[PDB]
């Protein structure tokens, strides 16, 4: 294996009187002739190395064959039909089907064919209270503009001419009379709420909110409660904070009452019961709380906590006369069922530890549906009986992976300083803890980002090859509260790396794998994680896979988009202490001559605004110049799902090959 020559320049930088050489400074220009030629030469060496891997084509074949599969959503009743979305696996847009009990299912609305070349997309969908009329918004191209169409659902023909010039709008019906929507014009950065009455022309739509000076806002929204009693109007100027107003529709010409008159917090309607409003908000509660207040005097001073804020971020769903609080605890789903009076009915017995969605329904739905998935289980739909709490399988995934063939377990290990850290491990059933299993340990560790379980075909293929997939919930993440995040920032960043090293040691100590059967992986802040751990403990793993990483911690902030990461990392310009700390772990600056590094495959696109290739380019150049051991230090520069399949195949093939496998660990 002969690496392309990478010339070293003479650039030398200085920080607080300290000199730091940057011989690959020229690689920071990803569009210069010399860099683009380097990229081409590196890719040639990498492709040549990968070409010798015997089973690379077989891995790619299985990935491609299992990548696409049919999907179906939960059914919902509107009028005399149950509607549900489906996707055959290749369709660009989901297709809406419907079925009347006692009859066969039929296609109801196929967005793909709304325009030859399928450039017309289905956005909002909203049926009248009786389900006889459907109002839905469509978008053309990558346009923010919308048209609201009105269809008679039985004949499937247009009821009226579509509403035009709609933008950033919801569609909320008031019974079967008409619906509220938002628009900037009549019917200029002044968003307004309008009411369209069925049987009338758009030009006659009543202006509801937003015209007088005190109501001028860039974004407004309107929602009518399911019982048609209240109109809630939200108004905002940006993504942070919104005012909220309520109007009692059961009263003749009721004025708007102020639920929240400032933009200091987010607050939104969950539902009402009688004159009681149920609101989800982050006002004085960053993790959110569910509150109630009487609609006749709805100001924040009167809000009463129904579900007080907790350490975990709250998501609320309502259905069948119950409220459901969803949280991710130790990074996995927990759902609690409450009645509208605040009594906790039960903790819902979810199918296992994973991620969920759903529990959304109408007041009178006899059952609710929820989706569940994790590293070893494809998205599956379950039916939930609200009264009994009974759960049953509604639709198994069409993905070519049977959940019963896999195992997912959560363990907790201790980091160097005693901190207990969560670790989710997945594999094919029948695995033995004899320390021989090829394992990929994945982590991120930063920016309050939580690593929660999610199914991916690529990971599932790894498990079928006989691999173990482990994900550590390191400090710096969002799995707990602010202290957990902060414990992995600025001058505490080392904790993240120590947490990851401890996960690798735990996997070995527990018999899942061993040093020559272990690979570590991560992207972006996760790439930094890999770069840092492989430079501090190059002997801990056999393979290192840093993707799109931030690897030059001394100059990351001077690059495009780097300024936004300053809160988590700090910059070499902050102070001598911050500079010394950053230089202490910066991967680029900690690669050393004579050291034997693990087999490495650095990955990145040839051009990137978020995380510039410069990081990966300079890091790969330095590994190639400094590594003295037998392992290859390669870089794969990306120049559709086709590319994703090729990327995953190269990584798994490279990983197994570097571990010495002549054949797959297990025949999939």
């Amino acid at each position: 294996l002969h690496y392309p020559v990478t010339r070293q320049g003479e650039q030398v930088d200085h920080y607080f009187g300290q000199a730091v050489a940057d011989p690959y400074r020229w690689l920071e220009d990803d569009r210069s002739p010399e860099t683009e030629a380097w990229v081409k030469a590196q890719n040639a060496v990498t492709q040549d190395y990968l070409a010798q891997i015997p089973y690379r084509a077989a891995i790619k074949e299985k990935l491609a064959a299992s990548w696409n599969y049919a999907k179906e959503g939960a059914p919902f009743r509107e009028g005399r039909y149950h509607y549900f979305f489906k996707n055959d696996g290749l369709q660009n847009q989901n297709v809406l089907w419907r079925q009347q009990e006692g009859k066969p299912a039929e296609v109801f609305l196929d967005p793909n064919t709304l325009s030859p070349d399928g450039t017309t997309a289905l956005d909002q969908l909203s049926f009248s209270r009786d389900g006889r009329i459907l109002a839905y918004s469509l978008s053309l191209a990558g346009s923010d503009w919308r048209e609201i169409h009105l269809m008679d659902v039985e004949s499937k023909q247009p009821l009226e001419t579509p509403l035009k010039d709609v933008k950033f709008s919801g569609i909320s019906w008031l019974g079967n009379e008409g619906f509220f929507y938002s628009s900037y014009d009549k019917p200029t950065d002044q968003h307004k709420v309008y009411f369209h009455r069925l049987g009338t022309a758009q030009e006659d739509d009543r202006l509801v909110f937003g015209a007088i000076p005190a109501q001028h806002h860039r974004y407004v929204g309107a929602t009518v409660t399911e019982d048609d009693r209240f109109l809630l109007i939200s108004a905002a100027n940006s993504t942070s904070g919104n005012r909220l107003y309520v109007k009692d529709l059961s009263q003749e010409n009721a004025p708007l009452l102020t639920v929240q008159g400032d933009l200091d917090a987010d607050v939104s309607l969950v539902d009402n019961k009688g004159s009681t409003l149920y609101l989800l908000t982050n006002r004085d509660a960053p993790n959110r709380r569910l509150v109630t207040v009487d609609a006749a005097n709805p100001g924040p001073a009167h809000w009463r906590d129904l579900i007080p804020e907790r350490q975990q971020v709250l998501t609320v769903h309502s259905g069948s006369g119950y409220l459901f609080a969803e949280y991710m605890v130790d990074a996995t789903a927990r759902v609690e069922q409450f009645d509208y009076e605040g009594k906790r009915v039960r903790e819902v017995a979810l199918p296992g530890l994973g991620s969920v969605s759903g529990f959304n329904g109408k007041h009178d739905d006899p059952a609710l549906y929820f989706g569940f998935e994790n590293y070893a289980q494809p998205p599956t739909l379950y039916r939930f009986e609200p009264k009994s709490g009974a759960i049953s399988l509604y639709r198994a995934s069409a993905a070519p992976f049977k959940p019963e063939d896999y195992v997912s377990e959560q363990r907790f290990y201790q980091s160097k300083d005693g901190t207990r850290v969560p670790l989710i491990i997945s594999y094919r059933k029948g695995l033995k803890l004899d320390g021989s299993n090829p394992t990929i340990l994945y982590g991120y560790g930063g920016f309050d980002v939580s690593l929660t379980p999610s199914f991916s075909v690529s990971v599932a293929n790894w498990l079928d090859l006989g691999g173990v997939y482990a994900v550590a919930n390191l400090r710096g993440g969002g799995e707990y509260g602010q202290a957990w995040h902060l414990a992995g920032t600025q001058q505490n960043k080392q904790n993240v790396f120590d947490d990851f090293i401890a996960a690798a040691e735990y996997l070995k100590a527990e018999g899942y794998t061993r040093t020559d059967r272990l690979a570590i992986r991560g992207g972006s802040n996760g790439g930094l994680l890999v770069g840092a751990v492989m430079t501090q403990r190059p002997d801990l793993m056999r393979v290192a896979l840093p993707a799109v990483g931030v690897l030059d911690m001394l100059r990351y902030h001077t690059f495009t988009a780097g300024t936004g990461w300053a809160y988590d990392y700090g910059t070499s310009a902050d102070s001598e202490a911050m500079f010394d700390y950053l230089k202490g772990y910066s991967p680029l600056h900690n690669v050393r001559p004579g050291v034997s590094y693990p087999s490495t495959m650095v990955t990145t696109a040839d051009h990137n605004d978020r995380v510039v290739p410069a990081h990966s380019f300079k890091f790969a150049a330095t590994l190639q110049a400094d590594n003295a051991g037998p392992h290859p230090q390669l870089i794969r520069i990306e120049t559709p799902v086709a590319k994703l399949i090729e990327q995953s195949a190269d990584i798994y093939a490279f990983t197994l090959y570097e571990m010495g496998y002549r054949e797959l660990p297990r025949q999939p």
């Binding site: 960053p286 804020e309 350490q311 309050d448 602010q482 202290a483 995040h485």
Partner: peptide
């Protein structure tokens, strides 16, 4: 406050 997020 404290271990809160």
């Amino acid at each position: 406050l404290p271990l809160w997020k």
